[PDB]
Structure 1
Amino acid sequence: AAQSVDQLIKARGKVYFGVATDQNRLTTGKNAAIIQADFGMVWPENSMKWDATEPSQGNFNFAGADYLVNWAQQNGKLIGGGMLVWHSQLPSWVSSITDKNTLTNVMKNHITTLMTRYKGKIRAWDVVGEAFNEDGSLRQTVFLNVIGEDYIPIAFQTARAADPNAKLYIMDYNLDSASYPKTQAIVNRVKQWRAAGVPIDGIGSQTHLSAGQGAGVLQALPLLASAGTPEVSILMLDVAGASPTDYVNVVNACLNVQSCVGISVFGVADPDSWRASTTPLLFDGNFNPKPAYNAIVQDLQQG
């Protein structure tokens, strides 16, 4: 009884506990069974990234994304998408563009095409990811360099037009400490963009922790919430060593922040992690729930 973290988190008033996946996870291991039972939202591990979806200008690849969207619909799961504008996994045809009008239109087309395809089916998009340097200045990607800092407002405005139903998020990593310049900076810039009417509905904190860093998220998450977005989230969570303590502290940070809609982990089982040697996830290599999973369950159960 009372072993789904998603079901338990919803009972506490949150939207979901989610997980990244894709077609070949769904067809292998025990991923599909675990997601069916335990998780309420799925995100494309890779199939919606720019290198996967638009490998040459205007030529899109949607087989993988479609597979995930369909599976999520068939299994009654919410679906997230992203990242629409991101410097990593970004084809060389984009990064070679030097003309402002041409990159603006290429960016807008990428956004619009993905969001239109899935219009009305996607809870939330990560519209812009990893836009910040560690010092809090904006990262000098092709977007910044060629379009300028208006590429962020343009990306969100384009997204809202493409699918007004989706929650639109900015996401970044190393927003885990409240004193860190990057944390402070994304709040200040998101406040300013929202004051200019940019439709930033959420800040997503891509939470990749080392052992003992869970505690600090209890202060960093409320600070992100202070930017005034309707939502914030913990995304792509993983924790080197998968201490119960670190995991429960992240969880509780979300519970404590009224605008935090949920938490997503960056895969199901350790061996399928990008950092497997750190065993950073909630299920082991035999697909058994780990102590951290059980400690989340106890944390979320109610009297």
Structure 2
Amino acid sequence: TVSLTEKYKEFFKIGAAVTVKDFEGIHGRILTKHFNSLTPENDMKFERIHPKEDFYNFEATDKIKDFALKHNMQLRGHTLVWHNQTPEWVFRDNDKEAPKELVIERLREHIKTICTRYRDVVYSWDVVNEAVEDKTDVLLRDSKWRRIIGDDYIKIAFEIAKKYTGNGKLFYNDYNNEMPYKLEKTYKVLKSLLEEGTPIDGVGIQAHWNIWDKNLIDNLKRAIETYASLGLEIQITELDISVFEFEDRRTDLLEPTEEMVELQAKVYEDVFRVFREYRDVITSVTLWGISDRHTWKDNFPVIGRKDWPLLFDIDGKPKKAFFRIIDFLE
């Protein structure tokens, strides 16, 4: 019974994505033993915490914060500005589209309100999430934030958040951003934001990975080096390691194959060895979930199947991958 966080205390924070139900039963005990960082899985998303202009839902996030404070943990704030889960009131002005400066003012108020409430426990914020275009040639993903505020909206969000976040670190967070095509694109955007004085402290690599990606290790090294060459910290923000290739949508498996279990333990040992290696630039590694009992990979990208992407199994027990990644000395 080595604690993962205690084992990694000299390298980086060890975090898990949570909702309030995780504070109960086995998940509760796993968190308080092994993790010193929590990311609210959903409860800080714009639409969830701020569903109408005059209505915030602070209860779930307060509980997460109260939990973190009671157990000596800190939060990641996920996430302020994202093309998904942003309610439609933000972009409407009675029966018309809201203009740029009204949207900015709404965003300023939302950031002030939420960052003021939680900056005492939050050590890093995903200020902007998934702004870089994943599918076409163009740099920036089309979104209502982008359409209405214009291409400056990333810098604008960061300069706002900076005002209200104390000294939490401010992150740009995205997925596949270790892959060759997306890494290049994201390098350009970040380098250009930083050249314009945007107070971005770090890049979040979501790390939705799978056991079959033969390029993973080399991509991950090349990514960390490239972002670090910008002066940026790196956080691994949503790590899980699916047993399925992304396009393998089979729904029959009731448990992982033995090839799966063994490949997964190796992939985990391997990425954590990379994490340890770049420990001067990685400040936190968060897993997107606690145990395979509850994972968003059961419904994404296939509704209603089962995946086993995490470090603890369906009964809450340390998997092979767990004993793999605690296997080193400092």
- Give the alignment's TM-score, normalised by structure 2: 0.85
What is residue 153 of structure 1 aligned with on the other side? Answer: 155
Q: Matched residues in 2 for 1:249 and 1:205: separation?
A: 16
Partner of 1:105: 105
Q: How does 1:51-130 map to 2 (within 5 A)?
A: 51-96=47-92, 97-130=97-130
* SS of residue paired to 1:123: strand
Once structures 1 and 2 are overlaid, which stretch shifts more, 200-209 or 119-128? Answer: 119-128
Deviations 1:69-120 (A, max 9, x none): 0100000012111101011122122354441111111112111111011233
Q: 1:182 Cα deviation (Å)?
A: 1.5
Aligned equivalent of 2:321: 292
Instruction: State the alpha-carbon separation in 2 of the partners of residues 199 and 153 from structure 1.
Output: 8
The number of residues matched between the two structures is 294
Give the 3-state SS of the residue equivalent to 2:78 in structure 1.
strand
Find the residue that maps to 1:198 and give its secondary structure. Answer: coil
Partner of 1:262: 284
User: Which blocks of at least 5 consecutive residues in structure 1 are unaligned?
Assistant: none
Is 2:152 the counterpart of 1:183? no
- CA–CA separation in structure 1 for the residues paired with 2:114 and 2:231: 27
> Partner residue of 1:247?
268
Cα gap change, 1:249/1:58 in structure 2, threshold over 3 Å: closer, same or farther?
farther
Counterpart contact for 1:44–1:80, Cα < 8 Å: yes
Amino acid at match of 1:9: Y
After superposition, what is the alpha-carbon deviation per residue over 1:51-85, rounded to whole angstroms, capped at 9, x for unaligned? 11100113211000000001000000121111010
Spell out, residue by residue over 1:249-295, the C-alpha distance to the aligned partner (whole angstroms, 9 max, x if none): 22222222221112110011113101132211111111111111111
Q: Larger Rg: 1 or 2?
A: 2
Cα RMSD between the aligned structures?
Answer: 1.6
Amino acid paired to 2:29: A
Q: For 1:275, what is the secondary structure of its paired residue?
A: helix
Q: TM-score, normalised by structure 1?
A: 0.92
Letter in 2 for 1:5: L
Please say if 1:205 is aligned against 2:205: yes
Identity %: 30
